[PDB]
mmCIF file of all heavy atoms in Angstrom:
data_model
loop_
_atom_site.group_PDB
_atom_site.id
_atom_site.type_symbol
_atom_site.label_atom_id
_atom_site.label_comp_id
_atom_site.label_asym_id
_atom_site.label_seq_id
_atom_site.Cartn_x
_atom_site.Cartn_y
_atom_site.Cartn_z
ATOM 1 N N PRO A 638 163.838 110.887 -213.060
ATOM 2 C CA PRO A 638 163.783 109.528 -213.605
ATOM 3 C C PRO A 638 163.595 108.493 -212.506
ATOM 4 O O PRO A 638 164.102 108.638 -211.392
ATOM 5 C CB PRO A 638 165.138 109.371 -214.306
ATOM 6 C CG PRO A 638 166.023 110.360 -213.657
ATOM 7 C CD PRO A 638 165.148 111.517 -213.289
ATOM 8 N N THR A 639 162.851 107.442 -212.835
ATOM 9 C CA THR A 639 162.666 106.335 -211.915
ATOM 10 C C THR A 639 163.988 105.604 -211.706
ATOM 11 O O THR A 639 164.900 105.662 -212.535
ATOM 12 C CB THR A 639 161.603 105.374 -212.449
ATOM 13 O OG1 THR A 639 160.387 106.093 -212.691
ATOM 14 C CG2 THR A 639 161.331 104.256 -211.456
ATOM 15 N N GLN A 640 164.088 104.912 -210.572
ATOM 16 C CA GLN A 640 165.331 104.237 -210.230
ATOM 17 C C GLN A 640 165.736 103.206 -211.277
ATOM 18 O O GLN A 640 166.917 102.852 -211.356
ATOM 19 C CB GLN A 640 165.198 103.568 -208.862
ATOM 20 C CG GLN A 640 166.523 103.227 -208.217
ATOM 21 C CD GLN A 640 166.356 102.542 -206.879
ATOM 22 O OE1 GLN A 640 165.238 102.353 -206.402
ATOM 23 N NE2 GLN A 640 167.471 102.166 -206.263
ATOM 24 N N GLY A 641 164.790 102.716 -212.075
ATOM 25 C CA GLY A 641 165.090 101.778 -213.137
ATOM 26 C C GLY A 641 165.555 102.396 -214.434
ATOM 27 O O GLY A 641 165.890 101.665 -215.370
ATOM 28 N N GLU A 642 165.588 103.725 -214.520
ATOM 29 C CA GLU A 642 165.995 104.435 -215.724
ATOM 30 C C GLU A 642 167.411 104.991 -215.631
ATOM 31 O O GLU A 642 167.811 105.780 -216.491
ATOM 32 C CB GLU A 642 165.026 105.584 -216.010
ATOM 33 C CG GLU A 642 163.558 105.210 -215.950
ATOM 34 C CD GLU A 642 162.658 106.422 -216.064
ATOM 35 O OE1 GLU A 642 163.119 107.449 -216.600
ATOM 36 O OE2 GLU A 642 161.498 106.354 -215.612
ATOM 37 N N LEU A 643 168.175 104.605 -214.613
ATOM 38 C CA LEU A 643 169.456 105.233 -214.326
ATOM 39 C C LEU A 643 170.638 104.527 -214.975
ATOM 40 O O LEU A 643 171.783 104.918 -214.727
ATOM 41 C CB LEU A 643 169.676 105.305 -212.813
ATOM 42 C CG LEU A 643 168.649 106.130 -212.033
ATOM 43 C CD1 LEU A 643 168.944 106.071 -210.548
ATOM 44 C CD2 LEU A 643 168.623 107.569 -212.520
ATOM 45 N N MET A 644 170.404 103.508 -215.786
ATOM 46 C CA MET A 644 171.504 102.879 -216.498
ATOM 47 C C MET A 644 171.993 103.815 -217.599
ATOM 48 O O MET A 644 171.173 104.392 -218.323
ATOM 49 C CB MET A 644 171.074 101.543 -217.096
ATOM 50 C CG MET A 644 172.166 100.862 -217.905
ATOM 51 S SD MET A 644 171.772 99.173 -218.399
ATOM 52 C CE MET A 644 171.890 98.316 -216.832
ATOM 53 N N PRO A 645 173.304 104.002 -217.753
ATOM 54 C CA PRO A 645 173.802 104.777 -218.892
ATOM 55 C C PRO A 645 173.503 104.072 -220.204
ATOM 56 O O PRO A 645 173.338 102.854 -220.263
ATOM 57 C CB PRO A 645 175.313 104.861 -218.641
ATOM 58 C CG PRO A 645 175.504 104.495 -217.219
ATOM 59 C CD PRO A 645 174.404 103.554 -216.881
ATOM 60 N N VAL A 646 173.443 104.854 -221.277
ATOM 61 C CA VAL A 646 173.208 104.288 -222.599
ATOM 62 C C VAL A 646 174.481 103.576 -223.028
ATOM 63 O O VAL A 646 175.431 104.201 -223.509
ATOM 64 C CB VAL A 646 172.803 105.368 -223.624
ATOM 65 C CG1 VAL A 646 172.759 104.774 -225.024
ATOM 66 C CG2 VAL A 646 171.469 105.971 -223.243
ATOM 67 N N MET A 647 174.499 102.261 -222.856
ATOM 68 C CA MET A 647 175.670 101.437 -223.110
ATOM 69 C C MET A 647 175.231 99.982 -223.032
ATOM 70 O O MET A 647 174.049 99.682 -222.845
ATOM 71 C CB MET A 647 176.787 101.735 -222.103
ATOM 72 C CG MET A 647 176.369 101.511 -220.661
ATOM 73 S SD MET A 647 177.689 101.809 -219.476
ATOM 74 C CE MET A 647 178.791 100.460 -219.867
ATOM 75 N N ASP A 648 176.194 99.079 -223.162
ATOM 76 C CA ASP A 648 175.902 97.652 -223.113
ATOM 77 C C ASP A 648 175.568 97.233 -221.685
ATOM 78 O O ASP A 648 176.365 97.497 -220.771
ATOM 79 C CB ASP A 648 177.098 96.869 -223.633
ATOM 80 C CG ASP A 648 176.779 95.415 -223.884
ATOM 81 O OD1 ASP A 648 175.909 94.863 -223.180
ATOM 82 O OD2 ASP A 648 177.403 94.818 -224.784
ATOM 83 N N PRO A 649 174.422 96.590 -221.438
ATOM 84 C CA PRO A 649 174.100 96.200 -220.057
ATOM 85 C C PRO A 649 175.114 95.256 -219.440
ATOM 86 O O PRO A 649 175.363 95.336 -218.232
ATOM 87 C CB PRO A 649 172.719 95.545 -220.191
ATOM 88 C CG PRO A 649 172.608 95.154 -221.618
ATOM 89 C CD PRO A 649 173.365 96.188 -222.382
ATOM 90 N N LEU A 650 175.718 94.363 -220.224
ATOM 91 C CA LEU A 650 176.704 93.455 -219.648
ATOM 92 C C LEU A 650 177.983 94.196 -219.275
ATOM 93 O O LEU A 650 178.613 93.883 -218.258
ATOM 94 C CB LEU A 650 177.001 92.308 -220.614
ATOM 95 C CG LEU A 650 175.829 91.381 -220.955
ATOM 96 C CD1 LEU A 650 176.327 90.147 -221.685
ATOM 97 C CD2 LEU A 650 175.050 90.983 -219.712
ATOM 98 N N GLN A 651 178.384 95.183 -220.075
ATOM 99 C CA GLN A 651 179.519 96.010 -219.681
ATOM 100 C C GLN A 651 179.197 96.801 -218.420
ATOM 101 O O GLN A 651 180.059 96.979 -217.550
ATOM 102 C CB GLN A 651 179.915 96.949 -220.819
ATOM 103 C CG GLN A 651 181.239 97.660 -220.590
ATOM 104 C CD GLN A 651 182.416 96.707 -220.572
ATOM 105 O OE1 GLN A 651 182.632 95.956 -221.520
ATOM 106 N NE2 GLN A 651 183.181 96.730 -219.488
ATOM 107 N N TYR A 652 177.959 97.287 -218.302
ATOM 108 C CA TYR A 652 177.546 97.951 -217.070
ATOM 109 C C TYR A 652 177.651 97.006 -215.880
ATOM 110 O O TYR A 652 178.101 97.400 -214.798
ATOM 111 C CB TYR A 652 176.118 98.470 -217.216
ATOM 112 C CG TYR A 652 175.541 99.097 -215.968
ATOM 113 C CD1 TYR A 652 175.503 100.474 -215.819
ATOM 114 C CD2 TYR A 652 175.015 98.315 -214.948
ATOM 115 C CE1 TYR A 652 174.971 101.056 -214.689
ATOM 116 C CE2 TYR A 652 174.482 98.888 -213.812
ATOM 117 C CZ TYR A 652 174.461 100.260 -213.689
ATOM 118 O OH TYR A 652 173.932 100.840 -212.561
ATOM 119 N N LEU A 653 177.219 95.756 -216.059
ATOM 120 C CA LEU A 653 177.317 94.775 -214.983
ATOM 121 C C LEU A 653 178.769 94.521 -214.601
ATOM 122 O O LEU A 653 179.097 94.421 -213.413
ATOM 123 C CB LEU A 653 176.640 93.470 -215.402
ATOM 124 C CG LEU A 653 176.693 92.323 -214.391
ATOM 125 C CD1 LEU A 653 175.941 92.686 -213.121
ATOM 126 C CD2 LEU A 653 176.133 91.052 -215.000
ATOM 127 N N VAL A 654 179.650 94.403 -215.593
ATOM 128 C CA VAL A 654 181.068 94.202 -215.305
ATOM 129 C C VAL A 654 181.618 95.385 -214.520
ATOM 130 O O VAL A 654 182.360 95.212 -213.544
ATOM 131 C CB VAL A 654 181.852 93.975 -216.612
ATOM 132 C CG1 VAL A 654 183.349 94.002 -216.351
ATOM 133 C CG2 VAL A 654 181.453 92.656 -217.245
ATOM 134 N N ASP A 655 181.261 96.605 -214.929
ATOM 135 C CA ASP A 655 181.722 97.793 -214.217
ATOM 136 C C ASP A 655 181.242 97.786 -212.773
ATOM 137 O O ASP A 655 182.012 98.067 -211.847
ATOM 138 C CB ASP A 655 181.232 99.056 -214.930
ATOM 139 C CG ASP A 655 181.904 99.273 -216.271
ATOM 140 O OD1 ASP A 655 182.823 98.499 -216.612
ATOM 141 O OD2 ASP A 655 181.512 100.221 -216.982
ATOM 142 N N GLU A 656 179.962 97.473 -212.561
ATOM 143 C CA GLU A 656 179.411 97.484 -211.210
ATOM 144 C C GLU A 656 180.067 96.421 -210.338
ATOM 145 O O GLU A 656 180.367 96.670 -209.164
ATOM 146 C CB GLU A 656 177.899 97.276 -211.262
ATOM 147 C CG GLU A 656 177.206 97.410 -209.920
ATOM 148 C CD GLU A 656 177.256 98.821 -209.374
ATOM 149 O OE1 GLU A 656 177.713 99.724 -210.104
ATOM 150 O OE2 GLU A 656 176.838 99.028 -208.216
ATOM 151 N N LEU A 657 180.290 95.227 -210.888
ATOM 152 C CA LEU A 657 180.941 94.176 -210.115
ATOM 153 C C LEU A 657 182.374 94.559 -209.770
ATOM 154 O O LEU A 657 182.848 94.280 -208.663
ATOM 155 C CB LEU A 657 180.905 92.855 -210.883
ATOM 156 C CG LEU A 657 179.521 92.239 -211.102
ATOM 157 C CD1 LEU A 657 179.638 90.922 -211.844
ATOM 158 C CD2 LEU A 657 178.789 92.049 -209.784
ATOM 159 N N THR A 658 183.085 95.196 -210.704
ATOM 160 C CA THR A 658 184.430 95.673 -210.395
ATOM 161 C C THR A 658 184.395 96.718 -209.288
ATOM 162 O O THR A 658 185.225 96.692 -208.370
ATOM 163 C CB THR A 658 185.088 96.244 -211.651
ATOM 164 O OG1 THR A 658 185.182 95.223 -212.652
ATOM 165 C CG2 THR A 658 186.481 96.767 -211.336
ATOM 166 N N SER A 659 183.437 97.644 -209.353
ATOM 167 C CA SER A 659 183.322 98.656 -208.310
ATOM 168 C C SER A 659 183.067 98.013 -206.955
ATOM 169 O O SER A 659 183.650 98.422 -205.947
ATOM 170 C CB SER A 659 182.206 99.642 -208.646
ATOM 171 O OG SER A 659 182.553 100.445 -209.758
ATOM 172 N N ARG A 660 182.190 97.010 -206.911
ATOM 173 C CA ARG A 660 181.920 96.321 -205.653
ATOM 174 C C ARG A 660 183.169 95.621 -205.135
ATOM 175 O O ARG A 660 183.540 95.768 -203.964
ATOM 176 C CB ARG A 660 180.784 95.319 -205.838
ATOM 177 C CG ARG A 660 179.435 95.954 -206.076
ATOM 178 C CD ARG A 660 178.365 94.898 -206.231
ATOM 179 N NE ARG A 660 177.034 95.481 -206.339
ATOM 180 C CZ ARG A 660 175.914 94.778 -206.417
ATOM 181 N NH1 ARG A 660 175.926 93.454 -206.407
ATOM 182 N NH2 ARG A 660 174.752 95.417 -206.505
ATOM 183 N N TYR A 661 183.838 94.858 -205.999
ATOM 184 C CA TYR A 661 185.009 94.105 -205.573
ATOM 185 C C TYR A 661 186.152 95.011 -205.145
ATOM 186 O O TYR A 661 187.006 94.584 -204.361
ATOM 187 C CB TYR A 661 185.469 93.180 -206.699
ATOM 188 C CG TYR A 661 186.698 92.375 -206.359
ATOM 189 C CD1 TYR A 661 186.652 91.375 -205.400
ATOM 190 C CD2 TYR A 661 187.902 92.608 -207.003
ATOM 191 C CE1 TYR A 661 187.771 90.635 -205.086
ATOM 192 C CE2 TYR A 661 189.026 91.872 -206.698
ATOM 193 C CZ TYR A 661 188.955 90.888 -205.738
ATOM 194 O OH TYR A 661 190.074 90.151 -205.429
ATOM 195 N N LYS A 662 186.197 96.246 -205.641
ATOM 196 C CA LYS A 662 187.240 97.175 -205.224
ATOM 197 C C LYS A 662 186.866 97.916 -203.943
ATOM 198 O O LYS A 662 187.695 98.045 -203.037
ATOM 199 C CB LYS A 662 187.532 98.171 -206.349
ATOM 200 C CG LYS A 662 188.164 97.533 -207.578
ATOM 201 C CD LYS A 662 188.385 98.544 -208.692
ATOM 202 C CE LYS A 662 189.513 99.510 -208.368
ATOM 203 N NZ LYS A 662 190.810 98.809 -208.169
ATOM 204 N N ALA A 663 185.628 98.406 -203.848
ATOM 205 C CA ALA A 663 185.225 99.175 -202.677
ATOM 206 C C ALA A 663 185.124 98.292 -201.439
ATOM 207 O O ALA A 663 185.662 98.632 -200.379
ATOM 208 C CB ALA A 663 183.893 99.875 -202.945
ATOM 209 N N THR A 664 184.442 97.153 -201.551
ATOM 210 C CA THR A 664 184.223 96.272 -200.414
ATOM 211 C C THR A 664 184.844 94.896 -200.575
ATOM 212 O O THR A 664 185.243 94.298 -199.576
ATOM 213 C CB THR A 664 182.719 96.098 -200.151
ATOM 214 O OG1 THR A 664 182.084 95.563 -201.319
ATOM 215 C CG2 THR A 664 182.080 97.432 -199.793
ATOM 216 N N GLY A 665 184.937 94.379 -201.795
ATOM 217 C CA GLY A 665 185.515 93.068 -202.010
ATOM 218 C C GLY A 665 184.490 91.953 -201.976
ATOM 219 O O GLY A 665 184.654 90.975 -201.243
ATOM 220 N N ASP A 666 183.428 92.085 -202.766
ATOM 221 C CA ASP A 666 182.395 91.057 -202.827
ATOM 222 C C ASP A 666 182.951 89.827 -203.534
ATOM 223 O O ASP A 666 183.251 89.873 -204.732
ATOM 224 C CB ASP A 666 181.162 91.588 -203.551
ATOM 225 C CG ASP A 666 180.634 92.870 -202.941
ATOM 226 O OD1 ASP A 666 181.308 93.430 -202.052
ATOM 227 O OD2 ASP A 666 179.541 93.317 -203.350
ATOM 228 N N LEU A 667 183.095 88.723 -202.798
ATOM 229 C CA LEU A 667 183.545 87.485 -203.423
ATOM 230 C C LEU A 667 182.554 87.006 -204.473
ATOM 231 O O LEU A 667 182.952 86.401 -205.473
ATOM 232 C CB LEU A 667 183.764 86.403 -202.365
ATOM 233 C CG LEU A 667 185.081 86.466 -201.586
ATOM 234 C CD1 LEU A 667 185.134 85.368 -200.540
ATOM 235 C CD2 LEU A 667 186.269 86.359 -202.526
ATOM 236 N N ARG A 668 181.262 87.263 -204.266
ATOM 237 C CA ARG A 668 180.277 86.928 -205.287
ATOM 238 C C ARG A 668 180.530 87.719 -206.562
ATOM 239 O O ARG A 668 180.458 87.168 -207.667
ATOM 240 C CB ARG A 668 178.868 87.196 -204.760
ATOM 241 C CG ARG A 668 177.808 86.229 -205.265
ATOM 242 C CD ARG A 668 176.471 86.511 -204.600
ATOM 243 N NE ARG A 668 175.542 85.393 -204.708
ATOM 244 C CZ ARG A 668 174.334 85.368 -204.159
ATOM 245 N NH1 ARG A 668 173.873 86.389 -203.454
ATOM 246 N NH2 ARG A 668 173.570 84.293 -204.322
ATOM 247 N N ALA A 669 180.828 89.013 -206.432
ATOM 248 C CA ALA A 669 181.151 89.817 -207.605
ATOM 249 C C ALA A 669 182.418 89.311 -208.279
ATOM 250 O O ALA A 669 182.504 89.275 -209.511
ATOM 251 C CB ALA A 669 181.305 91.286 -207.213
ATOM 252 N N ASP A 670 183.415 88.918 -207.485
ATOM 253 C CA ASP A 670 184.636 88.366 -208.061
ATOM 254 C C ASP A 670 184.342 87.100 -208.857
ATOM 255 O O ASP A 670 184.845 86.928 -209.973
ATOM 256 C CB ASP A 670 185.652 88.086 -206.951
ATOM 257 C CG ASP A 670 187.016 87.692 -207.487
ATOM 258 O OD1 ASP A 670 187.085 86.833 -208.390
ATOM 259 O OD2 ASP A 670 188.025 88.243 -207.002
ATOM 260 N N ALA A 671 183.522 86.204 -208.305
ATOM 261 C CA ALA A 671 183.186 84.973 -209.015
ATOM 262 C C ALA A 671 182.396 85.265 -210.286
ATOM 263 O O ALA A 671 182.631 84.646 -211.335
ATOM 264 C CB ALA A 671 182.394 84.042 -208.097
ATOM 265 N N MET A 672 181.447 86.199 -210.210
ATOM 266 C CA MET A 672 180.663 86.546 -211.387
ATOM 267 C C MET A 672 181.554 87.111 -212.484
ATOM 268 O O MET A 672 181.407 86.755 -213.659
ATOM 269 C CB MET A 672 179.567 87.542 -211.009
ATOM 270 C CG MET A 672 178.474 86.943 -210.135
ATOM 271 S SD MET A 672 177.228 88.134 -209.616
ATOM 272 C CE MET A 672 176.417 88.489 -211.171
#
């Protein structure tokens, strides 16, 4: 699959929330925290 086909079958906004949480936990992206 192309790199753009790797989203799980789910709500894209929930996917975004999950990814931002992962970023803020692994590294602590203040941008992710604000988003």
Side-chain angles (χ1 to χ4, degrees):
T639 304
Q640 198 181 358
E642 312 173 22
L643 299 178
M644 178 171 288
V646 172
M647 59 178 292
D648 192 330
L650 297 191
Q651 191 66 56
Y652 176 100
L653 178 64
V654 170
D655 291 355
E656 186 67 7
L657 294 181
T658 300
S659 291
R660 291 181 175 183
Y661 179 68
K662 293 178 72 60
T664 58
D666 305 8
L667 280 178
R668 214 175 198 177
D670 188 313
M672 291 177 68

